Design a binder for this molecule. Structure first.
Ligand SMILES: *[C@@H]1O[C@H](CO)[C@@H](O[C@@H]2O[C@H](CO)[C@@H](O[C@@H]3O[C@H](CO)[C@@H](O)[C@H](O)[C@@H]3O)[C@H](O)[C@H]2NC(C)=O)[C@H](O)[C@H]1NC(C)=O
Ligand SMILES: *[C@@H]1O[C@H](CO)[C@@H](O[C@@H]2O[C@H](CO)[C@@H](O)[C@H](O)[C@H]2NC(C)=O)[C@H](O)[C@H]1NC(C)=O
Ligand SMILES: *[C@@H]1O[C@H](CO)[C@@H](O)[C@H](O)[C@H]1NC(C)=O
Ligand SMILES: *[C@@H]1O[C@H](CO)[C@@H](O)[C@H](O)[C@H]1NC(C)=O
Ligand SMILES: *[C@@H]1O[C@H](CO)[C@@H](O)[C@H](O)[C@H]1NC(C)=O
Ligand SMILES: *[C@@H]1O[C@H](CO)[C@@H](O)[C@H](O)[C@H]1NC(C)=O
Ligand SMILES: [Zn+2]
Lengths: 593, 196
């Protein structure tokens, strides 16, 4: 009669239907909220999230009744695996009863956290709008230090017990879903099977991360030296020319991005940086024109143009009707050919670039819409934001800026502003790579139970010093939970995406800028007008999750795994400048204070 | 003699759901096929067997007007020799079809905010439709050995699902009305003609 695979194909044919219908209703609900804030619409969004959850859990149980080992078309196997491999909620309802409340408890702490200036204890400030500013705009060692320690104390020490329980429960859920720890579970997202050598094993992710970081270390070391040296001139009496960097003295509340150390690290301050914002202002551009120029970019490579739903239903400019709105750039796929973008766009160069990034998302969304629902997503958690960044890299090149008509045709690329730009790039892109690798390595080890709680923070900072070159301002006992002082950690999110995403793009860029027969420094290419780039790219964007992410990558870059060489290339100009500048300095950090 | 009622078909107020497609006979009458191929409302106008404009000079023994509402991306399924759930489980045309397929977008009437879930389609069926077959069953589809006790369950699905037509949807997921004109070339008396 009818095999397990045949029955399951039908099963998926039905799920897809009920899934896309109920997702489209959730999506429309969430739109009505994010774009118009009302108690009513908030309620309705929660209601639809409830119906959606119910549906997904029931279907996941039903999916587990079709034994995967009897399903044999790898495409179907991937869909079933996704549907049945959902069991974060697969243990005592009591576990889910309160051990979801601790999760909720954590977020509420992080969201309501308030630390008071010891000099003005009356002046207690929140993180989101009152401390993040200090940590980005202040040069006062003492001010920055009271903010840093106040946060890690008031909040981290509270979150410490919660995080401990969180670990034991999440490890139980993992073990339940046949995964060694919450670590193995999260590293599932990279697991793949199919064809020959196109498969990927969760136990390789560690290798490849480590391997690639090994190759980035030189670059980072030099950036570190250079930043240190400049920082010494701002914070002398605090920085050893040979040690690590104090954690509060970096760009933000964590050393996540060294982006806001530019004023303190600018290579040639006299030379200003290309800011088309004035051009756009004078040329009386508006939001629609930004997005229309974006659309042209994608059309010129051979990608489609935005749907009409896109223009009709998108929030492209903060509303004047009074509606309260979440002003954060998002790119929506509401599952029925309804694609949209929610962005309080303003006439500025940044918004211009991010419009190209977000439409990059929409373009991915549109390209895989020919795939079954469960396969409608980027090959892994890195691909989407890699694609978005590709767009923003081409859009910003001085070449592209001229062709658009925002530069002056006779613009000159002095090797000095090139260096300024490549530094700022490094300060965000390269800087976060160490931080990101360490943070996930600490979490992975904790989940594997290789860091006994008695030595949790003792390794946290130990590792910070060895890998990130950062040292703790004051010493912290095991009453602290500094890693939980990050939205991602205390709010239960994978962080390794941010690392892999980065290695992935430069591969992509070197591959598409290689098809456009671009000659010269990779940091200066615009894939514009290149249909060969367009095709190379589209022929993977369509795949979605339907083939193993290794295959998708190979189709574009020509390789099956992370290769840091394109990244290194993208920065090779900056790298040589840095090496000279640190010739008569020490590069490296003595691990200890 | 008299003019054919093509109006009542195309400009009909309420349209049918593809699984319950509606059929109307064209009695002794003459119609101007030009008013059809001279209107710009029509998204898809593909004629099989016949020459579009020469119809105004031809004669046919019978004409059948089948009408149903479908999805944009499914209009490609209503053509001779096609696979799909629409062409296999709801409305199949014969490989030797000799008629025309006319279709237009209808977001304006068939879609509503929150969605007009009134139009439906057959998702599963034990065997493909035969040319011009119709199936308005509502029996639980039994995919496996376990018998469906007239209730939906494991490997036991209700066969008909609802299009959700929200105006914000994409063209391909947007409502499109479809009229299929079947022309009968028989040795019998020809009572459907044009400009003689
Ligand atoms: C991608 O392709 C477009 C289309 O060719 C490029 O934009 C075009 O660039 C040229 C070069 O500046 C423009 O030519 C100019 O034409 C005017 C008269 O129209 C003339 O006064 C100038 O002396 C010059 O010959 C052209 O107008 C312009 N746009 C169009 C629609 O043709 C673009 O530069 C290409 N590259 C990139 C990176 O976008
Ligand atoms: C934007 O898209 C529309 C349709 O999606 C384009 O109109 C099509 O234009 C192309 C190129 O001339 C033709 O191949 C099609 O036949 C046209 N119509 C349809 C219905 O597809 C329009 O040209 C596009 N414009 C830009 C600037 O991308
Ligand atoms: C926002 O939501 C409220 C709910 O009370 C609704 O009345 C209002 O019409 C909405 N605003 C729009 C649609 O602009
Ligand atoms: C798997 O199933 C789909 C069903 O539509 C089919 O297109 C494909 O050829 C099958 N085989 C492989 C190897 O994907
Ligand atoms: C830093 O200052 C700018 C204005 O100079 C302000 O807009 C921003 O909110 C401040 N804080 C940051 C960037 O964290
Ligand atoms: C439907 O009405 C329009 C004008 O209202 C007309 O042009 C068209 O031919 C009509 N359809 C018929 C007669 O089948
Ligand atoms: Zn994004």
């Amino acid at each position: 009669p009818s095999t397990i695979e045949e029955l399951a194909k039908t099963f998926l044919d039905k799920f897809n239907q009920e899934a896309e219908d109920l997702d489209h209703q959730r999506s429309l609900a969430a739109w009505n909220y994010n774009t118009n804030i009302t108690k009513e619409n908030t309620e309705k969004m929660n209601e639809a999230e409830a119906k959606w959850s119910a549906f997904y859990e029931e279907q996941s149980k039903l999916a587990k009744d079709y034994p995967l080992q009897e399903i044999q078309n790898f495409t179907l196997k991937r869909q079933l695996q996704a549907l049945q491999q959902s069991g974060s909620s697969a243990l005592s309802a009591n576990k889910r009863e309160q051990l979801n409340t601790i999760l909720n408890t954590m977020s509420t702490i992080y969201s309501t956290g308030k630390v008071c200036n010891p000099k003005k204890p009356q002046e207690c400030l929140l993180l989101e709008p009152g401390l993040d500013e200090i940590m980005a705009n202040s040069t006062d060692y003492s001010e920055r230090l009271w903010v840093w320690e106040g946060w890690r104390s008031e909040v981290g020490k509270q979150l410490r017990p919660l995080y401990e329980e969180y670990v034991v429960l999440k490890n139980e859920m993992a073990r339940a879903n046949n995964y060694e720890d919450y670590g193995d579970y999260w590293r599932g997202d990279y697991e793949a099977e199919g064809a020959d050598g196109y498969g990927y094993n969760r136990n390789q992710l560690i290798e490849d991360v480590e391997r690639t970081f090994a190759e980035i270390k030189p670059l980072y070391e030099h950036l570190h030296a250079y930043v240190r040296a400049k920082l010494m001139n701002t914070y002398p009496s605090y920085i050893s020319p040979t040690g690590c960097l104090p954690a509060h003295l970096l760009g933000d509340m964590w050393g996540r991005f060294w982006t806001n150390l530019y004023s303190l690290t600018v290579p040639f301050p006299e030379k200003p940086n290309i800011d088309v914002t004035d051009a756009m202002i004078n040329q009386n551009w508006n939001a629609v024109r930004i997005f229309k120029e974006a659309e042209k970019f994608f059309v010129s490579v051979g990608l489609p143009n935005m749907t009409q739903g896109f223009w009709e239903n998108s929030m492209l400019t903060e509303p004047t009707d009074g509606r309260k709105v979440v002003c954060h750039p998002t790119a929506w796929d509401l599952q029925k050919g309804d694609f949209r973008i929610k962005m309080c766009t303003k006439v500025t160069m940044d918004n211009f670039l991010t419009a190209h990034h977000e439409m990059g998302h929409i373009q991915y969304d549109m390209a895989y819409a020919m795939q079954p629902y469960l396969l409608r997503n980027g090959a892994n958690e890195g691909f989407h934001e890699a694609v978005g960044e590709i767009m923003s890299l081409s859009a910003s090149t001085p070449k592209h800026l001229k062709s658009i008509g925002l530069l002056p045709s006779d613009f000159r690329e002095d090797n000095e502003t090139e260096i300024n730009f490549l530094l700022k790039q490094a300060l965000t892109i390269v800087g976060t790579l160490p931080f990101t690798y360490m943070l996930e390595k600490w979490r992975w080890m904790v989940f594997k139970g290789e860091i006994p709680k008695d030595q949790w923070m003792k390794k946290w900072w130990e590792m910070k010093r060895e890998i990130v070159g950062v040292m703790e301002p004051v010493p912290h006992d095991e009453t602290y939970c500094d890693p939980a002082a990050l939205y991602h950690v205390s709010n239960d999110f994978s962080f390794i995406r941010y690392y892999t995403r980065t290695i992935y793009q430069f591969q992509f860029q070197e591959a598409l800028c290689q098809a456009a027969k671009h000659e010269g420094p990779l940091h200066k290419c615009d894939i514009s007008n290149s249909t060969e780039a367009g095709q190379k790219l589209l022929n993977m964007l369509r795949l979605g999750k339907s083939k193993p992410w290794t295959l998708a990558l190979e189709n574009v870059v020509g390789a099956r795994n992370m290769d840091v060489r394109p990244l290194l290339n993208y920065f090779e100009p900056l790298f040589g400048w840095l090496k000279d500048q640190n010739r008569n300095s020490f590069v490296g950090w003595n691990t200890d204070w | 003699t008299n003019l054919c009622p093509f109006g009542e078909v195309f400009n009909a107020t309420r349209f049918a759901s593809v699984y319950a497609w509606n059929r109307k006979r064209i009695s002794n009458c003459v119609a101007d096929y030009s008013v059809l191929y001279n209107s710009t409302s029509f998204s898809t106008f593909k004629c099989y067997g016949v020459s579009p404009t020469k119809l105004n000079d031809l004669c046919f023994t019978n004409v059948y007007a089948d009408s149903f509402v479908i999805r944009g991306d499914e209009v490609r399924q209503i053509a001779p020799g096609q696979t799909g759930k629409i062409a296999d489980y709801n409305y199949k045309l014969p490989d030797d079809f000799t008629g025309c397929v006319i279709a237009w977008n209808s977001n304006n009437l068939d879609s509503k905010v929150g969605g007009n879930y009134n139009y439906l389609y057959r998702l599963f069926r034990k065997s493909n439709l035969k040319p011009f077959e119709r199936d308005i069953s509502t029996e639980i589809y039994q995919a496996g050995s376990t018998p469906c006790n007239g209730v939906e369950g494991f490997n036991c699905y209700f066969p008909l699902q609802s299009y959700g037509f929200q105006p914000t949807n994409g063209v391909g997921y947007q409502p499109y009305r479809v009229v299929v004109l079947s022309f009968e070339l028989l040795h019998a008396p020809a009572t459907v003609c044009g400009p003689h």
